[PDB]
Structure 1
């Protein structure tokens, strides 16, 4: 209301708007590179999925359906994969995924099953540490365009815990890239059910020179690993899109606040000039 502090406020909010526009355009660039990486990685999973379809079609014996093919009965312990942005300002994406993880944990505890969560990205790790349930395995400081080696550190741990019986079922929650405006979480399983990509449309009997057991033992870890990679990369694209949208909204809000503060400053200036002129006129009289 002093006509000078309001000028400082306008300057600060204008700086906020400018830095936010910078954030928006850089985030748009990152979102586009991430979408390009998603497209480039798509063919590998696109091929492995029908491989899983055919292998699942061939392997029907429950006894020979070992490793990740054991639909173990009397579920006790389940593991979940949560992927979060490394940094904030992502909008409501982190709130959505963390709420989804929380309701997942509550539902699993309702069934009496112990749960364990591995966190991708610092925000998930910090949230789960603050809740009081320490994650077993964490992989933070993940790059914008991560390599599959980065996700191996959690994937191999999860599958080792799966094989040893420590965990019975494996799930993953990630920010699905529905559209550049909406990025909702999506739950997926990592216990290959029937590979419903194209069901069993293809029917060609293959020879397993390593052997059925060896083939499945080698391929299923790879399939779950590429599924995790796809989820993480989709989540990165969703993160960049959500940050871009959040910064666009923040810039618009900053400009609206600039307009409001300019109106207030103008009113303050007019009032100050009126007080000035009235006082000098009264002093004249």
Structure 2
């Protein structure tokens, strides 16, 4: 506080404000393109949604409700999927999703179900490595526009684990994009338990050339992979939105601190001028 250190501080926080505003702008463009990608992925997702509803409408017997469609009893092992940002600055989003994952692990262990972690994004990977859980499936360096082929390394592993009895149920934790400003973590069930939607009510009778059971066993894994891809893209959009909000708040805070530091600098400047003129007047007299 010597009217020169405060000047350096003011310059520093001004640089912070400029960098943060630039981050907010690029995060806005990122959110735009991520929303575009989500909407471009929407047709596959919803078409397969009503296709699955129609298929499970016909497959109603317990005997043929096997493989991925079976509603297993006496659940023993549960796998949860977590999608997290690869980088920080997201604000409370990473903390929120990891708190949700931790508490969900708490209830799943409360009922006696052993839990295994499958993580997208470096933040969740690092957190779960530090806390103790070894990543059963690890996938990082997912860009803002990931391809479905990039998720296979985890999704196929989870589906094979469920098929082999390793996991009796499957979950995903992702950041839902409620608004441009408001985002919460969400929980979804990955064992199908499909909805008796209008499609399920639809009685359009079909023909299954390779076979009903074969079509079922070939479409359930792809439906699950589509759900995971939707969740990952939703999480990417929420990541960019949360970074936008965090950087807007940081820019506003930096501007407020620049204002306060400018007030302090002006006070120091006036004090320095008063001190020097008082000393000069004393020396003259």
Q: Measure, in 2, the Cα distance between the counterparts of 1:196 and 1:34.
A: 31
What per-residue deviation string (whole Å, max 9, x for no partner) do you get for residues 54-96 of structure 1? 1111101112111111111110000100000010001110011
- The alpha-carbon deviation at position 213 of structure 1 amounts to 1.2
What per-residue deviation string (whole Å, max 9, x for no partner) do you get for residues 232-273 of structure 1? 001000000110111111000000000000000000000000
Q: Is the 8 A contact 1:52 1:195 kept in 2?
A: no
- The alpha-carbon deviation at position 40 of structure 1 amounts to 0.4
Q: Is the 8 A contact 1:14 1:258 kept in 2?
A: yes
Q: Measure, in 2, the Cα distance between the counterparts of 1:173 and 1:198.
A: 27
**Structure 1 segments (4+ residues) deviating >4 Å:** 196-199
Root-mean-square deviation over aligned CA pairs = 0.9
Q: Measure, in 2, the Cα distance between the counterparts of 1:4 and 1:46.
A: 62
2:174 corresponding residue in structure 1: 174
What per-residue deviation string (whole Å, max 9, x for no partner) do you get for residues 82-122 of structure 1? 00001000111001100000000000000010001100000
Aligned length: 285
Q: Is the 8 A contact 2:57 2:196 kept in 1?
A: no
Normalising by structure 2, report the TM-score.
0.98
Q: Measure, in 1, the Cα distance between the counterparts of 2:282 and 2:24.
A: 53
Q: Measure, in 2, the Cα distance between the counterparts of 1:132 and 1:219.
A: 35
Q: Measure, in 2, the Cα distance between the counterparts of 1:11 and 1:224.
A: 52
Normalising by structure 1, report the TM-score.
0.98
Q: Measure, in 2, the Cα distance between the counterparts of 1:193 and 1:235.
A: 23
Unaligned runs of 5+ in 1: none
Unaligned runs of 5+ in 2: none
Q: Is the 8 A contact 2:169 2:191 kept in 1?
A: yes
- The alpha-carbon deviation at position 198 of structure 1 amounts to 4.5
What per-residue deviation string (whole Å, max 9, x for no partner) do you get for residues 204-256 of structure 1? 12111111110111000000000000000010000001101111110000000
